[PDB]
Amino acid sequence: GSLTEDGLSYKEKFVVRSYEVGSNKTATVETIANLLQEVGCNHAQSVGFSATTTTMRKLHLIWVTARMHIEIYKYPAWGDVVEIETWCQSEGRIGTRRDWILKDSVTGEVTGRATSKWVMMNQDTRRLQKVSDDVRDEYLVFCPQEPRLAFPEENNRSLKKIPKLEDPAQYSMIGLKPRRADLDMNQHVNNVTYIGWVLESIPQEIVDTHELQVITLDYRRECQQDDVVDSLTTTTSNDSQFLHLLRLSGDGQEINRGTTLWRKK
Amino acid sequence: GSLTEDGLSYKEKFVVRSYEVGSNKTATVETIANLLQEVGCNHAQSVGFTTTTMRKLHLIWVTARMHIEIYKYPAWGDVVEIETWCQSEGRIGTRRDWILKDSVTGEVTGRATSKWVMMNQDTRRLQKVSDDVRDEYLVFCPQEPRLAFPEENNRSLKKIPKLEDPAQYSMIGLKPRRADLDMNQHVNNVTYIGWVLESIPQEIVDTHELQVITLDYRRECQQDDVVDSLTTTTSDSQFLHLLRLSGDGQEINRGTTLWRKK
Ligand SMILES: CCC(=O)N1CCC[C@@H](NS(C)(=O)=O)C1
Ligand SMILES: CCC(=O)N1CCC[C@@H](NS(C)(=O)=O)C1
Numbered sequence: 001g002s003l004t005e006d007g008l009s010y011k012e013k014f015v016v017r018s019y020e021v022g023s024n025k026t027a028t029v030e031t032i033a034n035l036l037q038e039v040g041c042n043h044a045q046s047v048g049f050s051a052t053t054t055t056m057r058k059l060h061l062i063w064v065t066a067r068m069h070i071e072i073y074k075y076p077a078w079g080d081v082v083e084i085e086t087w088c089q090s091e092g093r094i095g096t097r098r099d100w101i102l103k104d105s106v107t108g109e110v111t112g113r114a115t116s117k118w119v120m121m122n123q124d125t126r127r128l129q130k131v132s133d134d135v136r137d138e139y140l141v142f143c144p145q146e147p148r149l150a151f152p153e154e155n156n157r158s159l160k161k162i163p164k165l166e167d168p169a170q171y172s173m174i175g176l177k178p179r180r181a182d183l184d185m186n187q188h189v190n191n192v193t194y195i196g197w198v199l200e201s202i203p204q205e206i207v208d209t210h211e212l213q214v215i216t217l218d219y220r221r222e223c224q225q226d227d228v229v230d231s232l233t234t235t236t237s238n239d240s241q242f243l244h245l246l247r248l249s250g251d252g253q254e255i256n257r258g259t260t261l262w263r264k265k
Numbered sequence: 266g267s268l269t270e271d272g273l274s275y276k277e278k279f280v281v282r283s284y285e286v287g288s289n290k291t292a293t294v295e296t297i298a299n300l301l302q303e304v305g306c307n308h309a310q311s312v313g314f315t316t317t318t319m320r321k322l323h324l325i326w327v328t329a330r331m332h333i334e335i336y337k338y339p340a341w342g343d344v345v346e347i348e349t350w351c352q353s354e355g356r357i358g359t360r361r362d363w364i365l366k367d368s369v370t371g372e373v374t375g376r377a378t379s380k381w382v383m384m385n386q387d388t389r390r391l392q393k394v395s396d397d398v399r400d401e402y403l404v405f406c407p408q409e410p411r412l413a414f415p416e417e418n419n420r421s422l423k424k425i426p427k428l429e430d431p432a433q434y435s436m437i438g439l440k441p442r443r444a445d446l447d448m449n450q451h452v453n454n455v456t457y458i459g460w461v462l463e464s465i466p467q468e469i470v471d472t473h474e475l476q477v478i479t480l481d482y483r484r485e486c487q488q489d490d491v492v493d494s495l496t497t498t499t500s501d502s503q504f505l506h507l508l509r510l511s512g513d514g515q516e517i518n519r520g521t522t523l524w525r526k527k
Contacts, residue, residue: 018306019299019455021448030444034284041283045342078448079310175438180470181295181459185286185341192284196444207443 001042008144009087010043013105016076024265026075027082029199029212033070033192036100036114039084053138061135062123063096065116065191069151069158069216074104074111081105088143093130095119096139099150113150115158126222162218162257165245169232173200175249176229189223194256198244201233202260210240210262217244217258229255239263266307273407274350275308278368281339289527291338292345294462294475298333298455301363301377304347312405319398323386328454329358330380332414332421332479337367337374344368351406356393358382359402362413376413378421389485425481425519428507432495436463437511439492452486457518461506464496465522473502473524480506480520492517501525 001012020031044051051063076082083103091097095118102112120135121128151158182193198217199207223229228249236243239261246256266277285296309315316326339345346366354360358381365375383394414421445456461480462470486492491511499505501523508518 017299017303019302019447019453022443022446023448023450025448028444034282037284038282175440176442177438179439179459179463180287181293183287184284185288185290187288190284196442200442 001039001046003043003046004085007047008142009085010039010046011083011085012039012042013081013083014038016078016080016082018078021078023208024075024211026077028075029070029072029215030192030196032072032075032102032112033068033195035082035084036070036086037190037192039086039100040098043086043088047142053135055132055135055138060123061129062121063118064121064128064222065219066095066119067117067158067216067218068114068191068195069116069214070112070114071151071157071214072102072112072212074109075211076104076111082111087148088139089148090131090136090140090143091117093132093136095131099148101150115150157214157216157261160216162216162259163243164254164257165232165234165243169201169234169245171201171203171233173197173231176200176231177227178223178225183225187225189225191219194219194223194246197229197231197246198256198258199260201231201244202242206240206262209265211265212260213239213263214261215258217256219256221253221255223248223255266304266311268308268311269348272312273405274348275304275311276346276348277304277307278344278346279303281341281343281345283341286341288471289338289474291340293338294333294335294478295455295459297335297338297365297375298331298458300345300347301333301349302453302455304349304363305361308349308351316398317401319383319394324383324394324398325386326359326381327384328379328482329382330421330479330481331377331454331458332379332477333375333377334414334420334477335365335375335475337372338474339367339374345374350411351402352411353399353403353406354380356399358394362411364413378413420477420479420523423479425479425521426505427516427519428495428497428505432464432507433497434464434466435496436460436494439463439494440490441486441488446488450488452488454482457482457486457508460492460494460508461496461518461520462522464494464506465504469502469524472527474527475522476501476525477523478520480518482518484515484517486510486517 022028085101089097098116100114178189230249232245234243242260244258287293348364352360363377384391441452447453495507497505504522506520
C-alpha cells in the first residue's frame with residue numbers, strides 16, 4: 001500500500017485468503033472489517049502515528065470508535081484482489097471520521113463502502129472529551145479540506161439513531177467470552193469481535209438464504225477479557241432488517257447496539 | 266506465491282498484519298498456523314486440486330497431527346517467506362512440511378510438519394488410500410525424502426499421553442463462532458490451537474515465548490458442541506494439554522507445549 005499523489009488518502013490491495021471466506025466462498029464481513037482496520041493502521045503509519053499525536057501521548061489521550069457503518073454490494077471471492085482507499089476528516093470538536101471505498105482490482109467497480117466516527121478519550125479514566133485546538137492542528141494537514149464523504153446522500157443510513165432492543169428478544173446467543181485471538185497488541189477486545197458476536201444471534205436459516213448488505217453498529221462500552229456477553233436480535237420488518245443488542249451476561253450493562261439489513265441471494 | 270523451479274514445492278511471502286500480532290508486537294502462533302494452511306491451500310490450487318478422483322468415492326484428507334517449532338515470531342510489518350511440500354508416508358497417509366524464513370536475512374525462523382490421513386467424509390471412517398490414488402499425487406512430491414524435522418528421535422513423532430484428572434489449569438465453556446468455521450462449516454484446525462492455549466495461565470504467556478506445540482487430532486468438534494480445555498505443568502516450561510466435550514468428556518484433542526523465558 002501507499003499514500004495517493006496528494007497524500008490526503010491511502011490505497012492498499014489485498015488478496016482474499018482461504019481461511020477468510022464463508023460458506024458462499026466469498027470473504028466474510030468480519031474479514032472486510034479486519035482489512036479496513038489494517039488499511040487504516042498503515043495510513044497512520046505512513047504519515048507518522050502510533051493513532052496518537054505528540055500532544056495525545058503527553059496527556060494520556062486515545063482515539064476510540066463510537067460508530068461503525070459498512071455497506072457491501074459484492075463480497076470478494078477467495079483469490080480475488082480487493083483495493084481499499086481510506087482517508088480521515090475532522091468533525092469539529094466532536095472527533096474524527098474515517099471513510100473507506102472498496103473496489104474490484106480487475107473491473108474497478110465499487111463493491112463496498114464504510115464510515116466510522118472516532119472520539120477523543122482519556123486512556124486511564126475512560127472519560128470522553130472534545131478535540132482541543134492544539135491536537136486538531138497536528139492532524140488537519142493529513143485530511144482533505146473540502147468534504148469527501150463515502151456516504152454523502154441527503155438521508156443516509158449511517159447517521160440514523162439506533163433504538164434499544166426490548167425484552168424478550170426474538171433470538172439470542174448466550175455465554176460468549178473472548179479468547180486471546182479476540183484481543184489486540186494492547187490486550188483490548190478487537191472492535192471486529194463485536195461484529196461477530198452481534199451476528200451470532202442471527203438465525204442460521206437467515207445466513208444460509210440471505211447476504212448481509214448493511215451493518216450499523218454503535219459502541220457504548222468496552223468488553224473486558226474476563227467479561228461474558230449476551231447477543232440479542234429481533235426482526236424489525238424482499239429484505240430483512242434486524243435490531244441488535246450486546247450486553248454483559250450478569251448485570252445487563254449495555255456495551256453495543258446495532259442494525260443489520262439482509263437481501264435474498 | 267508460486268511453485269519452485271522443479272514444481273516439487275511452493276513458496277509464498279506474507280506481510281504481517283496489525284490484527285495478527287500479540288502483546289509483544291510479533292505474530293501469534295495462530296496467525297502462523299493460518300499462514301501454513303493458506304500456503305498449503307495455494308500449493309494444491311497451483312497443481313489442480315480437496316483432492317482428485319477420491320471425489321466420487323467421497324474421501325477427504327484430514328489432519329491427524331500438527332507440530333510447529335518457532336525460533337523467531339515475525340514482527341508487525343515484516344515479510345515472512347514460507348516454503349511447503351508434500352510426501353507419501355508409505356500407505357499410512359501423507360505428510361506436509363513447512364519452512365518459515367526471514368525475507369530480509371534469509372534465516373529459518375520456524376518450521377512445521379503435519380500428518381494427514383484419509384477418511385470417508387460421510388461415515389468418518391479412517392482407512393488407508395488405494396494404489397490408484399497413491400499415484401495421482403506422487404508426481405507432485407519429491408521422490409527422495411525431504412524432512413523439515415529429520416533428527417533421529419525428534420519431538421514431532423513422540424507419543425502424547427492422556428491428561429489425568431484433576432488438571433492443574435482449565436478454561437471451560439468454549440464454543441466456536443462463525444469466524445471459527447471454514448467454507449464447509451467445519452471448525453478449522455487453527456481454533457483447536459487457540460482453545461488449547463486458553464488454559465495456559467496469563468503469567469506464563471506474559472513471561473514466556475511459545476517455542477514448540479505438538480497437537481494430536483482425535484475427533485472433530487461440531488458447531489453446536491462445547492469444549493473444555495485442560496493443562497498441567499510437566500516440568501523451560503513444558504505442559505500437557507487436553508480438549509474434551511463439556512458434557513460426556515469425549516476426547517477431541519491432546520497435546521504438549523514448550524515455552525522459553527523471554
Ligand atoms: C492517516 C492518519 C490520520 O490522518 N489521522 C487523522 C486524525 C485521526 C487519526 N485517524 S483515526 C484514529 O483513524 O481517526 C490519525
Ligand atoms: C500440492 C498438493 C499436494 O501435493 N497434495 C498431495 C496429496 C495431499 C494433498 N495435500 S495435503 C491435503 O495438504 O496433505 C495434495
